[PDB]
Write a protein that binds this ligand. Structure first.
Ligand SMILES: Nc1ncnc2c1ncn2[C@@H]1O[C@H](COP(=O)(O)OP(=O)(O)O)[C@@H](O)[C@H]1O
Ligand SMILES: [Mg+2]
Ligand SMILES: [Mg+2]
Length: 327
């Protein structure tokens, strides 16, 4: 008997839901889901920026001092984040904490011009030194060379966690699932109905209440992560300030797309690239994405035109006829 299971909780500061189809005994699926959400709870205390408690916060507290020992997994995440910092030319920047914290208070007024200029001197991700010994049991260490520099993994954390969850589900012999971490999707395998079908993931209207999808894409074994100008913002004197920062200016990025969705085998990659591509804009995004052949992208423009890379365009269906899919 094929059974369908779902579970959701408020965790890592958002609503996380996993949906599973399985013929394994219910007890086994329940065990897997129990562990998925235990993982998420534990990982919140490792990765969460703005905590005091988290490993990340402790790491930030040691900026400008001695190397700090970290678990293999946090290390691996940092390696990847720096990787995308280099490839994207800093558009995605995991060492942007000093600036983000200044805007984080705004949500609760615009930062001061110089204060902002000052924070940016403390965002050189190239000053993040990762070192790992090669001998049996050698430790993994991180050193923030520049004083005042603060790590913030908010733009790659969900992807990292979705990949961890997929590993977990797979470890429990589950091969059909839809992982949703606050809009960060991973579609594992196929769902059940033509019997076995691709998952249908909706992309919201960037200006929409998010109750209905503008588009829907069919995918298997794939992450779908969207970066929008309206996922999170505050308004002051007629001006909207969204959460995604352009590290050159220190202000919310001004770009020629309303949203960019990345489709990748790894959600970690999809999450970082989605953020980078938003900051870069359409043309520079296309250039960067050519260096990642196994990745696909979907851009929604302010005039409601939609462009999709060759890998997914055939799998895209428009639900809101105000939008047009260019071929
Ligand atoms: N240019 C950037 N590079 C990396 N991280 C960023 C950047 N700008 C903002 N951030 C951090 O990442 C978060 C946004 O990441 P993103 O993945 O685009 O959105 P979401 O949080 O919805 O996944 C912000 O809340 C901020 O803390
Ligand atoms: Mg991101
Ligand atoms: Mg993200």
């Amino acid at each position: 008997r094929v059974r369908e299971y779902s579970r959701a909780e408020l965790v890592i500061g958002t609503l996380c839901r996993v949906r599973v189809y399985s013929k394994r005994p219910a007890a086994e699926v329940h065990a897997a889901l129990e562990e998925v959400f235990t993982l998420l709870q534990q990982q919140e205390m490792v990765l969460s920026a703005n905590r005091d408690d988290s490993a990340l916060a402790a790491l930030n507290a040691q900026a400008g001092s001695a190397p700090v020992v970290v678990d293999r997994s946090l290390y691996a995440l940092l390696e990847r984040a720096l990787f995308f910092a280099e490839k994207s030319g800093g558009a995605f920047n995991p060492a942007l904490g000093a600036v983000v914290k200044l805007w984080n208070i705004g949500f609760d007024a615009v930062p001061d011009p110089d204060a902002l200029k000052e924070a940016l001197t403390r965002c050189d991700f190239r000053q993040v030194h990762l070192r790992a010994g090669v001998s049996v049991g050698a430790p993994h260490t991180v050193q923030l060379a520049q004083a005042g520099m603060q790590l913030d993994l908010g733009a790659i954390a969900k992807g990292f966690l979705a990949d961890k969850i997929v590993q977990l589900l797979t470890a429990h012999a589950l091969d059909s699932a839809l992982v949703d971490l606050g809009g960060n999707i991973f579609a594992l395998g196929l769902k059940y109905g033509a019997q076995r079908l691709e998952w249908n993931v909706g992309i919201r209207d960037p200006h929409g209440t998010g109750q209905k999808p503008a588009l829907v894409v069919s995918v298997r074994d794939c992450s779908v992560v969207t970066s929008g100008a309206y996922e999170r913002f505050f308004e002051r004197d007629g001006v909207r300030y969204h959460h995604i920062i352009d590290p050159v200016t220190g202000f919310p990025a001004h770009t020629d797309v309303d949203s960019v969705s990345i489709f990748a085998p790894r959600s970690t990659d999809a999450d970082a690239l989605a953020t980078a591509c938003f900051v870069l804009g359409y043309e520079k995004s296309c250039a960067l994405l050519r260096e990642f052949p196994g990745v696909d992208a979907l851009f929604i423009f302010p005039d409601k035109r939609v462009r999709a890379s060759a890998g997914i365009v055939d799998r895209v269906r428009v639900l809101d006829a105000r939008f047009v899919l260019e071929r």
